[PDB]
Design a protein around this ligand. Structure first.
Ligand SMILES: Clc1ccc2c(c1)N(CCC[C@@H]1CCCNC1)c1ccncc1O2
Length: 270
């Protein structure tokens, strides 16, 4: 019943993930996003009924409220899967937000960064590893000031042993991946959060090529508080065991006195 149950609007974007369209549920009038994924181009499948991993992972996290975009429904077709997802309104992704406004005031980066951490914790707590945390995978609900994680298509079940496959973004990938093709979930996630935070406070990523990643030296082109630079360098420690846990990130001095999402919208987004 898919074509009667939702009403298709403009293409929101396309890339490695497939094609994603703006939509309306005709039932509720609810704004949704409609993601089409070609079966040919799915590396990794899961089960409940053989499905894309994204579907497994999203069901594991979609129980309860969160900073992750919910799987509302899904459909199989002969050559594609179709996923129905929350669409916040109005909305802008963090990539476009940063491309437009440049480097972000710390107070705002702090608010955004905290929310990302809450969301990643929530995922890990549900047994899910994202594997592609970056600006293009974070949405900002502009009215409520709430960040939501998207695109679980490179994700895995969380586990405590090493991962030897990676299908996320190279410049967000830790040096242990680049040199040895091995990493552990949590410490690789922390590396990529280090990259994210630098991107927030400088308006751009710290490392462009592999040689820079491997070397792991951070130069700041923008004025950034010494507390913030400390946290960034800590998350981008070359040795994974030298990186902080999520607990240590959230207890870090730069993370004190976070604004609530609502107060963050009033000040920085309205
Ligand atoms: Cl509104 C919304 C809801 C749920 C979404 C997505 C968007 N997207 C958005 C991707 C396109 C962006 C939009 C802005 C311009 N830059 C590119 C998405 C991408 C990949 N997997 C799941 C997704 O789920």
């Amino acid at each position: 019943p898919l074509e009667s149950q939702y009403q298709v609007g403009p293409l929101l974007g396309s890339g490695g993930f497939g094609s994603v369209y703006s939509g309306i549920r005709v039932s509720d009038n609810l704004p949704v996003a409609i993601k089409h994924v070609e079966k040919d181009r799915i590396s990794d499948w899961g089960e409940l009924t053989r499905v894309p991993m994204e579907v497994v992972l999203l069901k594991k996290v979609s129980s309860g409220f969160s900073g992750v975009i919910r799987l509302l429904d899904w459909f199989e077709r002969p050559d594609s899967f179709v996923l129905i997802l929350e669409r916040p309104e109005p909305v802008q992704d963090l990539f476009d937000f940063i491309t437009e406004r440049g480097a972000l005031q710390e107070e705002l980066a702090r608010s955004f960064f905290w929310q990302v951490l809450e969301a990643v914790r929530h995922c890990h707590n549900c047994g899910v590893l994202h594997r592609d945390i970056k600006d293009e995978n974070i949405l900002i609900d502009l009215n409520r000031g709430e960040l939501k994680l998207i695109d679980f298509g490179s994700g895995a079940l969380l586990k405590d042993t090493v991962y030897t496959d990676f299908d996320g973004t190279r410049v967000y990938s830790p040096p242990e991946w680049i040199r040895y093709h091995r990493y552990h979930g949590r410490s690789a996630a922390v590396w990529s959060l280090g990259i994210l935070l630098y991107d927030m406070v400088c308006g751009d990523i710290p490392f462009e090529h592999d040689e820079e990643i491997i070397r792991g030296q951070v130069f700041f082109r923008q004025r950034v508080s010494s507390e913030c630079q400390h946290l960034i360098r800590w998350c981008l420690a070359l040795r994974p065991s030298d990186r902080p846990t999520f607990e240590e990130i959230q207890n870090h001095p730069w993370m004190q006195d976070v604004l609530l999402p609502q107060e963050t919208a009033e000040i920085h987004l309205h």
